[PDB]
Amino acid sequence: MDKLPIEETLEDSPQTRSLLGVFEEDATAISNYMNQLYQAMHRIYDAQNELSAATHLTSKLLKEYEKEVMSSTLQQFSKVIDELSSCHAVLSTQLADAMMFPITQFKERDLKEILTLKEVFQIASNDHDAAINRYSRLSKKRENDKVKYEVTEDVYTSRKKQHQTMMHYFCALNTLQYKKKIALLEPLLGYMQAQISFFKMGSENLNEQLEEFLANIGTSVQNVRREMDSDIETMQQTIEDLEVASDPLYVPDPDPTKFPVNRNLTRKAGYLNARNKSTWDRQFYFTQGGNLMSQARGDVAGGLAMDIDNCSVMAVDCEDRRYCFQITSFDGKKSSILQAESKKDHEEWICTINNISK
């Protein structure tokens, strides 16, 4: 730590001005470095806050994303994530008070006061210059004591203020010589101690639950893994045997020797086309109890088509279409004309309806 000579502030030598200039240069360099340091520490601060924020946000997403296994796993995860977020938060606060505050007060109190006293001193100096110049310009042979006295004590005033301001400036800089050291060390010390508190907190609180969480999730992941290579394993060639067996069935109109007509069916279901004045709509027909029910594919529920428990049914020629048939209630009420895709389904539908009715 070096210092300015407050005792020659009165003389105001160019040497003293030079030394002051040296100190001013140093204070400028200090201001620059401390400003960039403030930038770095501020960046750290914003980063930490951003961490806590992101953690919290992820947690929140989880917590309205369960809104069997997976739900409890996700709330354990949400819980540990919130404790981590808490850690980042307390670290943020301790950073704010222990780190950001000291350097901020250094740049907003001490440096600003230095600049203030500096410019006050500059102004006082200029005023004294003016004053002593007007004093020098006084007339020798014709002297008016009034103007002479006014100029003289203007010189007195400006000179006194110059002395005082220069002295405050000097003392401020000399004190600054110590304050800069502390200004460098204290916020970093705070940063480090914040890191210590952070990692200790996390160390024996966050770490326990992270361990137990890892324990549970590991088991669950093992389970789902096993069960999923199981059911992928036999789904693959359940598919293979389904592909093997389905190959004769793709033919729309199977030949009678391949798939014979079953005349014993008490129940039947399949797609049929129904003429309703005059398009032909494909729907899924199925027998339930003594009723013939139908449901359009891509609708959520069926509907009553016919009451077949007492009726007749016959092959019908309509619109030159193949495999059409129609039902007639004992009432005389008739169904829509229904078209099958094959001779087998035609005769099976007719025969089945006959089996169900009287």
Added chain:
Amino acid sequence: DKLLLEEALQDSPQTRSLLSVFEEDAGTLTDYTNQLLQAMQRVYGAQNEMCLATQQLSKQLLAYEKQNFALGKGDEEVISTLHYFSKVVDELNLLHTELAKQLADTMVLPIIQFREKDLTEVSTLKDLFGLASNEHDLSMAKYSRLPKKKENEKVKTEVGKEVAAARRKQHLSSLQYYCALNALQYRKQMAMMEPMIGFAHGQINFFKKGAEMFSKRMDSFLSSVADMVQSIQVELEAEAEKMRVSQQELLSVDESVYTPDSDVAAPQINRNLIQKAGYLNLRNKTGLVTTTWERLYFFTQGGNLMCQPRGAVAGGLIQDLDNCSVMAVDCEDRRYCFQITTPNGKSGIILQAESRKENEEWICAINNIS
């Protein structure tokens, strides 16, 4: 429940209903995975920017020594401390970097990869199932419309072939799609459990190595640094109030000290002065008319008169005084002017003081030196 592959071929509206359910919360799943991806990427990004931040801090701490300027050599107390701190910050940076890479590898990108090809696989298979379905529907339509009474067996058999082909292709597509969804049911769980585990591992290693980094040793060091800081502080206030009362009795003096020509009624003059320093006004006349005055510092050193302007690092020799002469003169109706005449007798430079006493004492000083 699960989708039944053996019921795929029949393609009943109930099967279509269950399929529609599967599709709907497939979409739901996709949306949530998008949201989760955004959250993860924000976490990773945050960790990364913390890395950059610590890197910058470290680089800044090192820049202090690289800093130079006027007072002297910066203390090696703070230089060593800052160097040490920069090292610690670098280590912490390493930890943060490892955590960031852990989040990226074991958390964000597994979710990402899930999205790209498991979810797009489901999507694509769904679209092939869709087009196959449409084509099959068309085929069955043009099969249905075939004539009964007058039959072209060739047209009929070929149309039948179209229908069979379309039906087979849709059956296969349906099997693939249903298998895909049933798989998706488990793959959702795996996709969201893997990143949880990765994140957990990253966090425990980060906090364990962090705990190892900042030990009881580090905190004793911080305690030492803290003790240095308050020593510096105690010497700061001590010198501060020392400077306070030094200030307050230098600033408390009588008016006359600041008042020019205080003494004028009875000036107190030292006529044996061999040495003098103070501000004088130097006259500069380069024409026969126009004249300027400049306030400059003047001091005697040995037998020489030296002149330094304020703001100048060094003073120069204005005049050699030893065989010169000096006397009070009158110039431009100004008070307290005196003049130095050179050895050969030429009238030389003209100066001005602010008081009777400083004028007479300057004159006497120069006379004595001569």
